[PDB]
Amino acid sequence: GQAEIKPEDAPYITNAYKPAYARWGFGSDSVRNHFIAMSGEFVGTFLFLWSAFVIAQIANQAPETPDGGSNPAQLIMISFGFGFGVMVGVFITYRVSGGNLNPAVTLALVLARAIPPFRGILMAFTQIVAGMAAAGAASAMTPGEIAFANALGGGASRTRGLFLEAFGTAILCLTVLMLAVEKHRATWFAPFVIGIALLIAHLICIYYTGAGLNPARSFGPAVAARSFPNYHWIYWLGPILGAFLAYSIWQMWKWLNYQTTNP
Amino acid sequence: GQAEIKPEDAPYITNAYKPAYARWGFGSDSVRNHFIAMSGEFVGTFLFLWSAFVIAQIANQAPETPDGGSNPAQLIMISFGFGFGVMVGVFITYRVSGGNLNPAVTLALVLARAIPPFRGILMAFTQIVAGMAAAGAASAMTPGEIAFANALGGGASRTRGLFLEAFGTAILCLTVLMLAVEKHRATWFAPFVIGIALLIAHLICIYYTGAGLNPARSFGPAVAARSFPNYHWIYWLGPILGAFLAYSIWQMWKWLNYQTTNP
Amino acid sequence: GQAEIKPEDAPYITNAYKPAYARWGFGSDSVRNHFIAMSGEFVGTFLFLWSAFVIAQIANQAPETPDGGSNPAQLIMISFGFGFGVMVGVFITYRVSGGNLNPAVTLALVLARAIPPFRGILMAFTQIVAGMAAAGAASAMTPGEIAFANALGGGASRTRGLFLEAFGTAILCLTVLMLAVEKHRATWFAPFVIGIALLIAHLICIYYTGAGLNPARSFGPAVAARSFPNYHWIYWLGPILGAFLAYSIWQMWKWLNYQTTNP
Amino acid sequence: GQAEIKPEDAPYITNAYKPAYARWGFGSDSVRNHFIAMSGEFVGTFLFLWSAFVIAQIANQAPETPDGGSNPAQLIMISFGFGFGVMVGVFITYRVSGGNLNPAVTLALVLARAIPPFRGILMAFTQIVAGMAAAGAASAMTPGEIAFANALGGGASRTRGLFLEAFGTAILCLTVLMLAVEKHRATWFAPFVIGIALLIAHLICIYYTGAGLNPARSFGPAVAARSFPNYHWIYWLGPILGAFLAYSIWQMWKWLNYQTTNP
Ligand SMILES: CCCCCCCCO[C@@H]1O[C@H](CO)[C@@H](O)[C@H](O)[C@H]1O
Ligand SMILES: CCCCCCCCO[C@@H]1O[C@H](CO)[C@@H](O)[C@H](O)[C@H]1O
Ligand SMILES: CCCCCCCCO[C@@H]1O[C@H](CO)[C@@H](O)[C@H](O)[C@H]1O
Ligand SMILES: CCCCCCCCO[C@@H]1O[C@H](CO)[C@@H](O)[C@H](O)[C@H]1O
Ligand SMILES: CCCCCCCCO[C@@H]1O[C@H](CO)[C@@H](O)[C@H](O)[C@H]1O
Ligand SMILES: CCCCCCCCO[C@@H]1O[C@H](CO)[C@@H](O)[C@H](O)[C@H]1O
Ligand SMILES: CCCCCCCCO[C@@H]1O[C@H](CO)[C@@H](O)[C@H](O)[C@H]1O
Ligand SMILES: CCCCCCCCO[C@@H]1O[C@H](CO)[C@@H](O)[C@H](O)[C@H]1O
Ligand SMILES: CCCCCCCCO[C@@H]1O[C@H](CO)[C@@H](O)[C@H](O)[C@H]1O
Ligand SMILES: CCCCCCCCO[C@@H]1O[C@H](CO)[C@@H](O)[C@H](O)[C@H]1O
Ligand SMILES: CCCCCCCCO[C@@H]1O[C@H](CO)[C@@H](O)[C@H](O)[C@H]1O
Ligand SMILES: CCCCCCCCO[C@@H]1O[C@H](CO)[C@@H](O)[C@H](O)[C@H]1O
Ligand SMILES: CCCCCCCCO[C@@H]1O[C@H](CO)[C@@H](O)[C@H](O)[C@H]1O
Ligand SMILES: CCCCCCCCO[C@@H]1O[C@H](CO)[C@@H](O)[C@H](O)[C@H]1O
Ligand SMILES: CCCCCCCCO[C@@H]1O[C@H](CO)[C@@H](O)[C@H](O)[C@H]1O
Ligand SMILES: CCCCCCCCO[C@@H]1O[C@H](CO)[C@@H](O)[C@H](O)[C@H]1O
Ligand SMILES: [Cl-]
Ligand SMILES: [Cl-]
Ligand SMILES: [Cl-]
Ligand SMILES: [Cl-]
Ligand SMILES: [Cl-]
């Protein structure tokens, strides 16, 4: 009735592939543990954003599309850079820091009480510094003017851009909450679903807002380009609103004990 | 012969990642449980269709292709919006409502007796309202005329469109039946396969019918655009026929005890 | 040291997601079991090839590329139709017939003794009839001349085409052998890897041979178009050689007891 | 509290899907075992690189983009050839050799002490010979001049190219280290994540360096084309630096006992 597990194969069963924040209980507030979490967020955010910035730099060397029209292949390439970039970053750092790689994701998880506030602030600070470093590195490593900073486009107003950013970020954060924070037989696979959520959010937003969805992603290139549009606030308030919306939905489902027919 | 499961990791084993309908037994008819199912279908259908509508809006800003020709990159982008959009929606809501997000899928599951008729009707109503909301939101958040409503194209007749919709929907529903409704070691992964099935169905249908495959997807934009083509019925009858075809195939396999060599 | 499995969740553990051929032992030669296998191959091959034929029909409505050049977006779309089409077909039919959907795959598995010769012949016959049906249906459901039949292109000779088909088919068959036929913790996931293998084989072959890789795929459209090129034999001999090459590699590894350090 | 495993299904549980190097302990230095490892690296590297070379050959038949601009669809196609090509190669050979398919990956794993130096050298030699064979085969099987050799482009300097190659290779090697070398419930899935990492690294590098990321990938086509650019060294030093960077990050995390809150 049972299948044998050879001793040498036990680690593949005993070592759960779960986000680090799931096991941040007593003992977590050591300098060692804060450093581990910061190092995961730094390495993960740097590799994700650096990759995606260079990919966007390249995609934006495509010949101009007339009459402000869209270029689907270009948008797909950029969406792959961020979606698959984050997927790889999260898979790498899942057991180091949980792979948030995004202050808005960290905010949603602080609201959900998956991550305590101080650790959350440390992680968010680390992500922003990593975004600055990634933007500086991508700039230094590519020819031409920086083409990976966020800006409104496609005829979108600031108000439309704000909403697009908020809803796009909500999809991302709700994915992290339901797949990574909730504990079940698919938690291990959350980094994939998270990557696809960000891919979709880019297909929604790049054409209209450049796709911020992540204050660390938006801030870094603005620093490197020495250019902040006056509507830069949409790349902070939008994702913040998105985090709160995702948290609210998750919280309603938690209050309802959603996963259980007869609680 | 056994591998140890640490107590803190038990939830990743004990909490099955299974569609909510699999555990809708005694106790399911409470107002609480009807609300949970409706909330999953609403949130899931809204996020999926809103995302996919904005993505289609953008893709359809590509320069016109001469002589009625196809634009593969454009079709790929739209197919990603719906296929990956549904994938994310289903992964998020799998343990809330089962993530049908489509009245034709719900119909197939009512025929299969996976979901009872009244709950099915509630879910289908919820999906249609969510589709209306998504269409209204996508319209309000994007510039220009609505470009995400379904219409015949590529020289396809209504009769050809009806068949394409029926067969495309059958592929989707048969995927849900064999991967999500059938209970096995891949049930947890059904949301991925479901997303790929919808991706393929879009590559089949967008050019010719706009790809309905989902009455809630077709109805919402028609309301928002205040425009119903006289052939709008193909987006209802087609998916209905597809649900019946998928159900029929599944039912034959169930009668045959397909999964067992010696029943 | 153990994690509890709730009784209602046991089916997700006890019901292995494994190819049907893995459990075709004593009792398999009943009319019922032959019919089940044929029905899986028919439904799976029809849905896969019908989908992929319509997708290719659409992709080939793209404006002509000058000077015989390639169109990467077009090639990607067609490769998705076949790669994701087969992925969905195999996931649906894995526990019905094993989801070969390809006489060359069945041949490799007959050589490997995973499927007995008579059952193999029945399956191969079924796949060819399903390919004819799919080609007829795709033709009837789409406007214009059939654009999904295989032909040499891109300046490739018959001899080059033969080799491309053989190597492409070998990649496909070796994937099925190592992921689906070999029994391990990734067998359940083989349909995904199989789909990606076919996706790659299409990116290799479409431009030069139209990508046969499957005698049932090549034969059906030729019948529907009432057109057989004199080099049609490359779409039979190529995949046959590929099946033998994959089998040979697998057989060497089996003789070597590849998976065990100290046999 | 437990779910039954039928005896015929035990192999899907007992046979771990783990990289071969994980079980190269006592007994590994036999001629048989060296041959098994070499055969996995040869077959895997040949199929991966041959596929990707033909796909790149085809993608590079696209009409020229004016003013040195990028072609996103072309870059996506090439990135799929290498990313999905390696994914398939690694899935096939995971239990044969571990599926390194890349001297830089092998170097990272020798540094990490996952593979001993002599076996590592044998594997690296095998990969280079397989790359030469793949380049020769791809050349012989395709018309026109070889279009799959690495070269600088997009206005990138040798110094920028070196850094892009190093960082891109680091992402690849860190993925292998954290997903395949580290033992946990996602180790079986590493071939997927590895493939996506290489896909991303191609979106970063193709436009600027042709994307080497693998000395065996760069050397083979140079031999077949009888052409070595004077900056060919970037395709050796870059990936070597990337392997060392990935190793360094992993080693820091190992020293920190990253995966454990209270060591
Ligand atoms: C001195 C007695 C107090 C010791 C503090 C309790 C240590 C709890 O520590 C917790 O242990 C769990 C396993 O039990 C781990 O999963 C968590 O990572 C860890 O934070
Ligand atoms: C879920 C509901 C989202 C509502 C977001 C709508 C944002 C309003 O968008 C506004 O639409 C106007 C149309 O007259 C335009 O004139 C404005 O420029 C634009 O900002
Ligand atoms: C307007 C739509 C009506 C919404 C009904 C919400 C369902 C509330 O249902 C309540 O949920 C509580 C928290 O889980 C439980 O403690 C109660 O048993 C249950 O009655
Ligand atoms: C013995 C008298 C009981 C009267 C209450 C009947 C309400 C039935 O309702 C049940 O309530 C249970 C407990 O809250 C929930 O777990 C079930 O989901 C719900 O269906
Ligand atoms: C008063 C005695 C009658 C109680 C009704 C039986 C409750 C069955 O309820 C069922 O229990 C299963 C677990 O056993 C769960 O998996 C299902 O979700 C649930 O519907
Ligand atoms: C599985 C079989 C599907 C059959 C669907 C075929 C739909 C018929 O399609 C019809 O084909 C005619 C060709 O002469 C055209 O003139 C019609 O306009 C078109 O509607
Ligand atoms: C024309 C093609 C012939 C189709 C043969 C169908 C196979 C029927 O097979 C029957 O299936 C029943 C239901 O599972 C079983 O109860 C019987 O034991 C079995 O004989
Ligand atoms: C003792 C006399 C038995 C005569 C019937 C022989 C039929 C063998 O046929 C067997 O029948 C079994 C029971 O239906 C099925 O489970 C097997 O799949 C089938 O192969
Ligand atoms: C009359 C005594 C002979 C009976 C024939 C043996 C039946 C073997 O039948 C085999 O049983 C296995 C489970 O044990 C299943 O996994 C296989 O699907 C089945 O073919
Ligand atoms: C693994 C080795 C594969 C070898 C396949 C090579 C197929 C030969 O290809 C041949 O190349 C010639 C070049 O002069 C051309 O003139 C021929 O038209 C062409 O058929
Ligand atoms: C020219 C390259 C040399 C190839 C060496 C092949 C390795 C053969 O190795 C042999 O394999 C047999 C089958 O597994 C085993 O029975 C023997 O123990 C073993 O010596
Ligand atoms: C007691 C004398 C033994 C002399 C033979 C030494 C060969 C060591 O070689 C070992 O042989 C084993 C059995 O074939 C294999 O399982 C191991 O993989 C191999 O390393
Ligand atoms: C003669 C006594 C010395 C025998 C050498 C020890 C053989 C160890 O050999 C190891 O065994 C492990 C399982 O235990 C396997 O997982 C490893 O693949 C294998 O290398
Ligand atoms: C992580 C930091 C990466 C630094 C890599 C920067 C590579 C330097 O790149 C250099 O930039 C100069 C700009 O003036 C150009 O003139 C040079 O041609 C170019 O090689
Ligand atoms: C400048 C930033 C400070 C970096 C702090 C590094 C954290 C070191 O933390 C140390 O790690 C050792 C190895 O795991 C442990 O043995 C010690 O218990 C622990 O104090
Ligand atoms: C009994 C006196 C103990 C004083 C040391 C308090 C340091 C608490 O720090 C703890 O140290 C543990 C052991 O190194 C680690 O496992 C925990 O992660 C860390 O939080
Ligand atoms: Cl503490
Ligand atoms: Cl009830
Ligand atoms: Cl029998
Ligand atoms: Cl030894
Ligand atoms: Cl799994």
Residue numbers in the entry:
A (entry chain A), B (entry chain A), C (entry chain A), D (entry chain A): 11 to 273
Task: Give passages from the manuscript.
Aquaporins are transmembrane proteins that facilitate the flow of water through cellular membranes. An unusual characteristic of yeast aquaporins is that they frequently contain an extended N terminus of unknown function. The tetramer consists of four independent water channels, in which each monomer has six transmembrane helices that adopt the typical “hourglass” fold. Loops B and E insert into the membrane and together form a seventh transmembrane pseudo-helix containing the aspargine-proline-alanine (NPA) aquaporin signature motif near the center of the water channel.
The structure was determined from two crystals obtained at different pHs. As is common for aquaporins, Aqy1 crystallized as a tetrameric assembly in the I4 space group with one monomer per asymmetric unit, with crystals growing as stacked membrane bilayers having a gap of approximately 22 Å between the tetramer surfaces. In particular, the N and C termini do not take part in crystal formation and hence the conformation of these termini is not influenced by crystal packing. In contrast, our crystal structure of Aqy1, captured in a closed conformational state, shows that a tyrosine residue from the N terminus enters the pore and blocks the opening of the channel by hydrogen bonding to a water molecule within the pore. Specifically, the N terminus folds such that each Aqy1 protomer is intertwined with its neighbour within the tetramer via a helical bundle, which is stabilized by multiple hydrogen bond interactions. Hydrogen bond from Tyr27 anchors the bundle of Aqy1 to the aquaporin scaffold and Pro29 introduces a kink allowing Tyr31 to insert into the water channel. A HOLE representation of the pore profile reveals how the water channel narrows to 0.8 Å in diameter near Tyr31, which is too small to allow the passage of water. pH-triggered opening, which is known to close SoPIP2;1, can be excluded as a possible mechanism for Aqy1 since high-resolution structures recovered at both acidic and basic pH are identical, with a root mean square deviation of only 0.08 Å for 248 Cα atoms. Thus mechanosensitive gating emerges as a plausible mechanism.
